Amino acid sequence: HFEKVEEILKKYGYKRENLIKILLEIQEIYRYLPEDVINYVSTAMGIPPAKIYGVATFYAQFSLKPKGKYTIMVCDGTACHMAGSPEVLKAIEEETGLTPGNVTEDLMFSLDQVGCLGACALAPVMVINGEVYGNLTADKVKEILRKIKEKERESA
Amino acid sequence: MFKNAKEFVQYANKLKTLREKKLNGVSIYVCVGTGCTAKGALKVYSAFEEELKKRNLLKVTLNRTGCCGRCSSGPLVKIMPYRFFYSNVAPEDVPEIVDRTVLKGEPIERLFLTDPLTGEKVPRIEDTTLFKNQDFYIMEAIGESECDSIEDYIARSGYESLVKALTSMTPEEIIETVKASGLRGRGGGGFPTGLKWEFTRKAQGDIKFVVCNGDEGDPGAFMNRTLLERDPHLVLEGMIIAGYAVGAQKGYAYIRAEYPFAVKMFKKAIEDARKLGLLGENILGTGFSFDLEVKEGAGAFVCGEETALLASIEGKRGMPRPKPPFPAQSGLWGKPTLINNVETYANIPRILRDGVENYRKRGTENSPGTKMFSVAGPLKATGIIEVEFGTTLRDIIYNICGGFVEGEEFKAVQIGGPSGACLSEDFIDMPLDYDTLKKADAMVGSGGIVVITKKTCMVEVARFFLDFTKRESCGKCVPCREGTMQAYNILEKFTHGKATYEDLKTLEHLSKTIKTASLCGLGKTAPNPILSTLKLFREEYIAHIEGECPSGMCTAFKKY
Amino acid sequence: MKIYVDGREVIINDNERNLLEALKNVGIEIPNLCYLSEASIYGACRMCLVEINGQITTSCTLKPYEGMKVKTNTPEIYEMRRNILELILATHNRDCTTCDRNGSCKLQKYAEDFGIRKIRFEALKKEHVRDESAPVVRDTSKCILCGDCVRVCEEIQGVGVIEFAKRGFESVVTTAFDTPLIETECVLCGQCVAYCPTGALSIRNDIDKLIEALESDKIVIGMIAPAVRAAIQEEFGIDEDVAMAEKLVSFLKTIGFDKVFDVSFGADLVAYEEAHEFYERLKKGERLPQFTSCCPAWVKHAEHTYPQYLQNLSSVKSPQQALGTVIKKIYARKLGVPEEKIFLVSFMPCTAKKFEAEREEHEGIVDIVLTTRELAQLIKMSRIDINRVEPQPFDRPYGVSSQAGLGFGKAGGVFSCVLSVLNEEIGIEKVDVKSPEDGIRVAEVTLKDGTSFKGAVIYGLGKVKKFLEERKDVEIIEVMACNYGCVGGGGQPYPNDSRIREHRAKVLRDTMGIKSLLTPVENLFLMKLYEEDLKDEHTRHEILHTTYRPRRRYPEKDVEILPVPNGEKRTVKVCLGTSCYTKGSYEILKKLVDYVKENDMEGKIEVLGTFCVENCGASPNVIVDDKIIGGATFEKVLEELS
Amino acid sequence: RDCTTCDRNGSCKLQKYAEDFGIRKIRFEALKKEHVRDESAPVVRDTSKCILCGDCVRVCEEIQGVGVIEFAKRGFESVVTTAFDTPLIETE
Ligand SMILES: Cc1cc2nc3c(=O)[nH]c(=O)nc-3n(C[C@H](O)[C@H](O)[C@H](O)COP(=O)(O)O)c2cc1C
Ligand code: SF4
Ligand code: SF4
Ligand code: SF4
Ligand code: SF4
Ligand code: SF4
Ligand code: SF4
Ligand code: FES
Ligand code: FES
Ligand code: FES
Ligand code: FES
Ligand SMILES: [Zn+2]
16 A cells, blocks of 8 residues: 555656656655565556666665665765775774675664765765765774764663 | 747846845855865855844845855855955854954955965955966856856846847857857767757757756766856756757756755756746747756766666666667657757857857867866865866966875876876876877866875776776676676786786786777776776886885785 | 678678678678577677778678778787687686586587687676576576567567666676566566577476386376477477377387377367357357466466456366376276376476466376477487387377367467367358467457357467457457467477477478368267266366466565564564654664564564555554554563563 | 586587486585696696596507506596696606
8 A cells, every 4th residue: 555656656657757766756755665665666657577676776876775874975986085985994894894785784874885975175075864074084984983873872 | 038038138137237236235155066065064054044144134145156166175155245255164153254244344364265376365266376277268256156046147147148049040050150169079078069969950850859968977076066056057058059959849957866956956947947938838939949857867877878878868777779870860769869968058158158259269279168177186276177278287286276285296197087097297288188188098088187196006096997887887798797897806906916917918908808899988998097007007017916016005915 | 782801802782781680691600699599689799890991890780881891800809709708708607518508509609619718817706696486497697698588578578577687797687676486477488598598597307307207106197299299300400200299109108108198189178168168158248358278378477467357268277287187087097096196297398387287276287397308308318219210109098189189289279279169069151360460360250150259369478468458359369478379389499489480380280281080079089088077067167177366476575684584473573764764763673673682582573674654644663463553662662572 | 517618518428418318407416526637738637527438548558658647546536647646748
């Protein structure tokens, strides 16, 4: 019994030309692309599920696993890479035990390496839920990760 | 302004009067372009709002402006009546700015722009040495233009070129003037746009399409998004003029969903143009119909290819196909499609407003116009700059960007991302052109620039670019799909200090195969970094085969 | 047109699409790995490089022009072609001994010809998929990503269950979410296998079961499909041969088969039963139009796609199942041997018959189904010249069949058999046959009394959708999932293109022509079967009739965090949607995970993640034992867990 | 079982029988053998493809009269090799 998905499909008129936009909306709502959701979308649009799967796994914005509570985005652009982004990625791995494209056991953290964020003056750059932290290093990345970990752990 | 053009003329004149009124008064512009927001520009805007509201002295006005070319100089704020440019404006000193400057007007020395070359602070950005060393032809009204305002764009003489084209000129003359101006495709190829417009117009078909490629074509460049966030209506007007010239009734703008501000700005510009009648079923009552839509890019570097872009727009996987039949004949849904870069469309209205001789006054005989770049890497001043098509790399690196940060030295420069070239100091004194350096194994590219310093291992640079290309390959043809990963494996072996001369020979011979046999441009230029570094930095590869790494960053052997 | 190939005058053709095809028409071959089947396209292999005006380019995308100088062989082109082939072979699962394309693989032949004796590149690892849950077996480690199967499934079969996924080095042809092919909407027609140029797509081989059965003490009974005899001769590279079935009988009896029957007898029986059923439907004008149920691929397709037409499907089971049920339930009693003692072997040209034999409604009737290729393998193992085998007739009482029964092997066979049965029962004044499209034929039939109907024959799945959407003036519709009927089945010898299928149809027609009795009633054995065993309607219904059920995916596929493979548990699901994420849900999930980390030593509690449960606006939701809570939190889920 | 990079590919009796017998899987686990690969001489040795038919030994001894290759070890470790696994280029 899907309602929001039906609203999106009706808004875009069950047209394949708008499949990517529909999938972006569905991800924004569900935070990822569940198999059931796009199975329903395929049934409604008369498009085989394999087609939607091929489209979804081709573009980066689409994720097949739930996004982490604190989604981490580490720029891998040229400037950020020569500025020390691999060190940032290694620090993130050693701290949270994950590599880009993965999520933690409790969905607390997720990681994805992206292109230039338009802030090369702050290379290397990391983004967490829209909060950008520039001029990063291994020590700074580890320190901020611990701080956010404690902050979330508090709950209260 | 919805029936005749004289109403639009009167509307523009009164909007100009209103803009002059507001400009003469005290107004605040905070650069909300990408990079400045990363530094806290939006929080600065919030601080300005709250401080100016509690004091309740609004006849002040607060406005959002686009990139001003000094992204690295903190969030940017300037006041109009006294054109004082403020840099590194934190949300904590906003009340100080309001009290000292907005109310009284005393210059604030502590919050001005330093001069990287002369080591001094100048109150006005227009008086800065970097500003004078540049050539602003596309970017205009730096720091004093409202990105989200069709009213402001009209008040700055905007949309006049489209009206001139519609009421006065006929598509043939428009295409003729575009051809005469010599404008070349800013997307990187450099193909003459006028010839492309001829190809699209001559195509046999009643329905045609105009497609704008918003992609940067580089994972280290932010020119197109910055231009979109600066003056979206400029690109909008260029696209409308192109659709009129090639006789199209529908246009698509392809902006990445990863860029929320660019998408929002272009959507708002489109809605404003439609509301004001610039877009709709009857533009200015001349029998010409045209509408524009923004299509979200879900993220795929291969979508910069024309065929892949067309497949992506239509809702399929961005898979390129053998170019003939060309998109100029059969593009979107088999119909003729004009595909150009954002900067090309931005240039179009500028050429139309000016002449052909006036346009050619800037640049070279074969490359007229200007090019907007995005310089990065360790430099005193980094951000978006515009230069004439005759400038050298030294001018940009030192005189415009201020040079390198203390304790750093020049090694090499990347000019077009992975598809670009790696240039050493032997090409620094070579004027930029689509022809002068297209033969010395170099290319201007989409407009991205990244400087490489002595502490950078170039084998690692090649490895990084090949890793990117291996990730971005669509996987259709054997050469790119397989060879990119194999070459990345070889380069990784080189980085891990376990390579050999056999690996070097294999890489050199596989690069030729990838370059020649690949289907589309992604795989064709995939081995460009390898070829560039081996032609310019062979001794570093040899040292790596010996476990030396003169640069010494890539941690594979140390403290033994 | 005149062109210069390697410096010699060559005349290609007047109008041509590309240089490669023009030269191939001339007789000049350029190595390539694109033209691999009838569903092939050009541009992916990149191996057809030629040199023209200095620059190298692919000849498949090069439009020829008058007097063009083209060099098809230069040291640079040799280097590039060998590099491309080595790239393909580096990541290819090079185990040809156990491959189904061994000896008929273009990649293998090129590796031989190109003298590739060692891999200069690294055999990098991929996230390969190995699906063996269906008679169609997927092994993506042998896939060359030609895409022929995708085009076959989408454009030719109209199902589209397999597609390209991911990109770059990780590009893979697979089902959605790597779902097992048995669990998807795949109809198992086997056409993708028929067109696959590598071992990536293959048929499940069940020769071991047959051999262990023959070695046992059970009575093995074989029954051969009509279209198996029309194509088996290709595997041995010999010419067409009528009487193929009888020398097959001789060979099967030699290798230990106690009885061998003809599935054409089952086809005659099915045609008789379906003709009577269709006549009843006509006289009542109900449950029309009627669909033939002889093609299991079409039956499964209808169950997946046309749940409203399941009542229109013929109740009669397919010839394989009908004859097998007759054997197991009547012949066993006549022989005084328990049904467990009989081992039934079916030789079919179809992969969907393997699925049909394993259906719940057909459980235990057909023990194993072997395709034409597996039968050819059986013959080749013995190394006896089948051409020299003296034929002997099928075994009684299910050995003879009418020409109409043997016509089942190609499209339009069952419709013609039904027409013959009706004509014999009640004459047919005339039949007018039209051909709206290539694979669609419509017949207008007038009976002697005066009542008339319309019947359509559709071969090739995917043409059914348009016909059903636009044509509503028929009473009976024959649907065959494969082009040309069963002569082009999934299990037929490779290659399996249209020319060989037409030749197979011609061979089957020639075999039909030499049959004396023309209609099922003339089959004395069938009438004896009706008079002695199927005399009453109750036994006939339980023997020859089956029921069909709708198919719908049942995907739960909830996010797994701390799953428990089995055993009674609590299966707590935490919603991970945006609205629920907006306040708490993720914190609640973390707290519950840490709770089961400190408590819950055993698998009593199963912590799951789930997507939006359509209960937004009612605070974060936490599903417990498939129950809605609303306003959930750690304590509110602990209390319920108590 | 790597026929793509084998010199008998297309003219191997074992390959043809594997094709004909319908051997699409092996329930017998692939045991590990101390295989010998040699590349020192124009004549290349690879005992992992050897079926221990003994034809090469007879050819070398009876026909050519050199007898530099012979059966060594026994049982599962049976191998046709040179004395002390010496590289061919260093033997007679
Ligand atoms: C991998 C790849 C990425 C590309 N990215 C861009 C891009 O981001 N922007 C652009 O204008 N052209 C890009 N191009 C080039 C266009 O696909 C193509 O040249 C198009 O015709 C641009 O038209 P223009 O020359 O008028 O700008 C790319 C090409 C390739 C092969
Ligand atoms: S070169 Fe790369 S991106 Fe281009 S078609 Fe081939 S595989 Fe795709
Ligand atoms: S598809 Fe099979 S026969 Fe062909 S090369 Fe691969 S493993 Fe060998
Ligand atoms: S067997 Fe038929 S339906 Fe199934 S994947 Fe292959 S072509 Fe598609
Ligand atoms: S499975 Fe077979 S037909 Fe399909 S793409 Fe792979 S090799 Fe081609
Ligand atoms: S048409 Fe014949 S071979 Fe094809 S799926 Fe149907 S029964 Fe099987
Ligand atoms: S015993 Fe000798 S001839 Fe026989 S397979 Fe082994 S190496 Fe070859
Ligand atoms: S390269 Fe990372 S923000 Fe520009
Ligand atoms: S984004 Fe503000 S100066 Fe560039
Ligand atoms: S035949 Fe394959 S790319 Fe030309
Ligand atoms: S987001 Fe949880 S019920 Fe919808
Ligand atoms: Zn190094």
